[PDB]
Each structure stands twice: as structure tokens, then as C-alpha cells.
Amino acid sequence: KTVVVTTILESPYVMMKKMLEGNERYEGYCVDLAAEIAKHCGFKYKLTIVGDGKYGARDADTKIWNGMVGELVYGKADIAIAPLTITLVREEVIDFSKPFMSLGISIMIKESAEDLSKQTEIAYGTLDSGSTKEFFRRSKIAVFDKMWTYMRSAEPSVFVRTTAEGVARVRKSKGKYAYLLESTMNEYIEQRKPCDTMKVGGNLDSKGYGIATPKGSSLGNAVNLAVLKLNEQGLLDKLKNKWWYDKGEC
Ligand SMILES: C=C(C)[C@H]1CN[C@H](C(=O)O)[C@H]1CC(=O)O
């Protein structure tokens, strides 16, 4: 009947409109994407913000998945539409549609990863949890392995808790702090006032964000075909351009 969609606040994907109720309280790339996939697939839905404010990781002790991934695995949500990075660990427990948006870990400064690894004057870090941190932690690639060893033992801490915190740290560090984040957030922030940040070098890896559903879900097939169709029509490119560039501030 009414499909339960779990999502999360992260600009410009899902934001509180700056007096409203239900789905109309929200706006952003993922809000527009949810309406488009629902329209194509022919379903009614309710957007809900994930209670724990997490994307999805499996606790090492309890082995239970938290965040949006957890909501899908334990049957609390029917679908997740947000900047949820497609990773192998998540793919083992949930299904992802083809990418609706491409990205890679990138560097934000006020070059290359190899260049950051060989130096010591500019400090660098990632979020204290998430796919970016996990990529560095489990990487068997020499340069990233070195970067991780440096980040985990750096004092004071080079890690931050939110995107906003990583961005602010870059802005106030006089070129002494580089933030490692997904290229999509990097591109978005570059077009946000005070317009003083920049992406440098190529991405460290390659992946995307995908619509997620519980394993064996009936909705899976349909949502995947919808993503392929919206992509083919150029709609996803227009939608990214709308939220990143048309609404840019620089
Ligand atoms: C915004 C957050 C915390 C998310 C977005 N995609 C990643 C994920 O799905 O884990 C996280 C960012 C990152 O790890 O750099």
C-alpha cells in the first residue's frame, strides 16, 4: 500500500524546507528522486528519517546492522533512498539498484592521494565512521595503507564527525588540513558560499549511490529499471545539475 521509505538529512540530498506536513516538509535531490521512482513504479510512499541517524554498519560485537541498512535488513523499511554508498559489505545483506549517481573518495582543500601520503605538513582526515573511513582501514593498496596508518595514529585527531565539520576544518586551517570525502559532497560544497574550498586531483576509488531494498524484495526489480530509465532520459543528470549547479552560489 504505502511504501515505507527510510532516508536521512544530508545536503543537498534531503533537507528540511526553509507549516508543512508529511513528504512536503522535505526537499532535495533524493526527495525529487523518490517522487520520480514512485511515479515510474506506480506506488504511494512515506518518507521517514532514520531514527539513529546512521547509514549502515555491522556492530563487531552484536553483529547487528545499524542505520538505514538495518531498517531494511530487519524489515522496518521497504526502501532506502539517500546518498548510501554501494559497498561489498552492504551488498552482502541488501540489494542496490544500478548507480543513480557516480562518485569516488576525493580530496578537499582550501595533486593526488599519493602526494598527501608522501608529505607531512598538511594534515588530513576522514569522518570517524562510514564508507570512506572503512575504505582506508581495509585497503591493501600501499599508498592508502600508509595514509590510514598516518590518520589513525595522528595527534590531535584528524577525524571529524560530520560533513559540515570536515568542511569547516578545511576552511579554518590555512591550507593545513585536507578533508577526504565523497566527490559528490566535494562538488556540492565547492558551489557553496564562502566559495573557498576546492577538489584537487583524481578520485581515490570508484563507486556510486544506489537505491536499496531488502534482499529478495519484490520492489527491487522495478526500482532498478526505473533508475536505468531516468538515467537514459537524462533526468538524473538534470537533477544533479539542479541541486549542485543551478542552485549553486559561486
Ligand atoms: C554522509 C555520510 C556520513 C555518508 C554518505 N555516503 C557514505 C556512506 O554511505 O557511508 C558516507 C560518507 C563517507 O563515508 O565519506
Q: Give the 3-state DSSP-derived string for the chain, with helices as H, strands as E and coil as C.
A: CEEEEEECCECCCEEECCCCCHHHHEECHHHHHHHHHHHHHCCEEEEEECCCCCCCCECCCCCCECHHHHHHHCCCCCEECCCCECCHHHHCCEEECCCCEEECEEEEECCCHHHHHHCCCCEEECECCCHHHHHHHHCCCHHHHHHHHHHHHCCCCCCECCHHHHHHHHHCCCCCEEEEEEHHHHHHHHCCCCCCCEEECCCCCCEEECCEEECCCCHHHHHHHHHHHHHHCCHHHHHHHHHHHHCCCC
CB atoms within 10 A of CB 62: 8
Give the Å distance between the CA of 217 and the centre of ligand 1. Answer: 24
Among the CATH numbers 2.160.20.10, 1.10.150.20, 3.40.190.10, 3.40.50.300, which is that of 104-207?
A: 3.40.190.10
Reference 246, options 31, 29, 30; nearest CA is 29
Mutate to test the pocket of ligand 1, among 30, 106, 127, 179 (most ligand atoms within 8 A of CB): 127
Residue with cell 590510514: 148
β-partners of residue 80 are 6, 212
> What's the rounded Cα separation, in Å, for the pair 12 and 40?
23
Ligand 1 pocket check for 182: Cβ under 6 Å: yes
> What's the rounded Cα separation, in Å, for the pair 153 and 201?
25
Q: Does residue 182 have a known ligand-binding role? A: yes
Give the Å distance between the CA of 19 and the centre of ligand 1. Answer: 30
CATH 3.40.190.10 in the chain, residue ranges: 1-103+208-247, 104-207
Q: Does residue 83 have a known ligand-binding role? A: yes
Query: Letter for the amino acid at 92?
Result: E
Nearest CA to ligand 1 atom 3: 130
Are 200 and 14 contacting, i.e. CB atoms less than 8 angstroms apart?
no
Q: Which atom of ligand 1 is nearest to the CA of 56?
A: 10
Residues 6+ apart with CB under 8 A from 73: 65, 93, 94, 214
Are 200 and 111 contacting, i.e. CB atoms less than 8 angstroms apart?
yes
Resolution of the determined structure in angstroms stands at 1.6
Ligand 1 pocket check for 163: Cβ under 6 Å: yes
Write the CATH number of the domain with boundaries 1-103+208-247: 3.40.190.10
**The pairing of beta strand 101-103 with beta strand 207-209:** antiparallel
Give the Å distance between the CA of 133 and the centre of ligand 1. Answer: 9
> What's the rounded Cα separation, in Å, for the pair 134 and 136?
5
Which cell numbers in the block locate residue 176? 593545513
CB-count exposure of residue 187 (10 Å: 0-12, 13-18, 19+): middle
Could you tell me how many residues make up the chain?
A: 250
Mutate to test the pocket of ligand 1, among 132, 133, 139, 199 (most ligand atoms within 8 A of CB): 132
